Amino acid sequence: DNQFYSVEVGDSTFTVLKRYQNLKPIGSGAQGIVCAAYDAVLDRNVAIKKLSRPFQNQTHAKRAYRELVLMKCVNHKNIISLLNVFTPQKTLEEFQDVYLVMELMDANLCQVIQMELDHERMSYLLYQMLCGIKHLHSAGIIHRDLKPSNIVVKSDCTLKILDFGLARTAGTSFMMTPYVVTRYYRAPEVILGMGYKENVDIWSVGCIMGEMVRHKILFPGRDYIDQWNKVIEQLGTPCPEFMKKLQPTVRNYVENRPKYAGLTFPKLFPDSLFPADSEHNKLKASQARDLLSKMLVIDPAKRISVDDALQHPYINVWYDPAEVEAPPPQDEREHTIEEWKELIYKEVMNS
Ligand SMILES: *CCC(=O)Nc1cccc(C(=O)Nc2ccc(Nc3cc(-c4c(-c5ccc(F)cc5)nc(SC)n4C)ccn3)cc2)c1
């Protein structure tokens, strides 16, 4: 339409409503390309993400669809809120591309992770992640795949989570895919198919926190086997009560491995990794390790809750009940490509 215009961006074309001006690439990911733009209607800077033919892959289709639907089920400053959703195509038959628009953020969390460790920044970033997760949980959404690639940050250290994680059933049966999926941030109970509760998400917060300290991914498994091995190498073989919760076939798989004692948290995260040379810095290194030791707990029956993390002395200087308790607003079958296409098209057309 006359309502759209096209901009060349590397290999791609962004065909966007004319309100969006001065497009500039940010970059690309598994789920689309992103540009910054000025929105002349709102008089503010936005990020625009293009989803190309998401209906052509069942995993991509389900993600796009569930994320359009769940967008309306949350309302919190630490979770994505779309300003606009559109397609330049005019009929179901011609439909190919979805464009999502939100507030422009300044950086990916990975860029912050690369910066020198600072307790005020790390604690504030973790506090916001935990506020977001708590909000998701109150809306009935237990994420199970929180990772730095879906977290963005502004220059004022404010943070947003951009995705809603896994289908409800994921983590209720053993995880190995026909191809590589990375699972560096997924909880033990999920990857082993044990079922899960809310504190499944605390594991992933612990992975992120640890990564902030080390500047390195904690458990970078090459495949599902190596993933588990990176975990037990560092944290130790889990307790028999945890093994007893495994389906017998899974239990044999898990136990047919070396037995590890695990390393203490001071060895996992040495003093040298933290700011030194003041009582404040010594105490904060101790509190950070304490919190790490409570989140990076293989057995979810022994792992800290979201509320306990929020109330931990490392985090709680930021605690504001208006942020922590902000309330959310008042179907996962499989489908063919054509079914997914229509479902997604209908969601786009209706908001
Ligand atoms: C750690 C490695 C790295 O990222 N390096 C690096 C080096 C130099 C520059 C950059 C950089 O350009 N990063 C940057 C700039 C601006 C943003 N803003 C942004 C991105 C996103 C976004 C979206 C999205 C989702 C929904 C929507 F409606 C619009 C946009 N989807 C993704 S991929 C999960 N991103 C990142 C939203 C809002 N603002 C980010 C990063 C990086």
From Swiss-Prot:
Cofactor: Mg(2+)
Top-level taxon in the UniProt lineage: Eukaryota
Enzyme Commission code: 2.7.11.24
Post-translational modifications: Dually phosphorylated on Thr-177 and Tyr-179 by MAP2K4 and MAP2K7, which activates the enzyme. MAP2K7 shows a strong preference for Thr-177 while MAP2K4 phosphorylates Tyr-179 preferentially. Weakly autophosphorylated on threonine and tyrosine residues in vitro.
GO terms for cellular component: cytoplasm; cytosol; mitochondrion; nucleoplasm; nucleus; plasma membrane
Residue span of motif TXY: 177-179
Regulation of protein activity: Activated by threonine and tyrosine phosphorylation by two dual specificity kinases, MAP2K4 and MAP2K7. MAP2K7 phosphorylates MAPK10 on Thr-177 causing a conformational change and a large increase in Vmax. MAP2K4 then phosphorylates Tyr-179 resulting in a further increase in Vmax. Inhibited by dual specificity phosphatases, such as DUSP1. Inhibited by HDAC9.
Compartmental location: Cytoplasm; Membrane; Nucleus; Mitochondrion
Tissue expression summary: Specific to a subset of neurons in the nervous system. Present in the hippocampus and areas, cerebellum, striatum, brain stem, and weakly in the spinal cord. Very weak expression in testis and kidney.
Tagged with keyword Membrane: yes
Name used for this protein in its record: Mitogen-activated protein kinase 10
Organism: Homo sapiens
Gene name in the database record: MAPK10
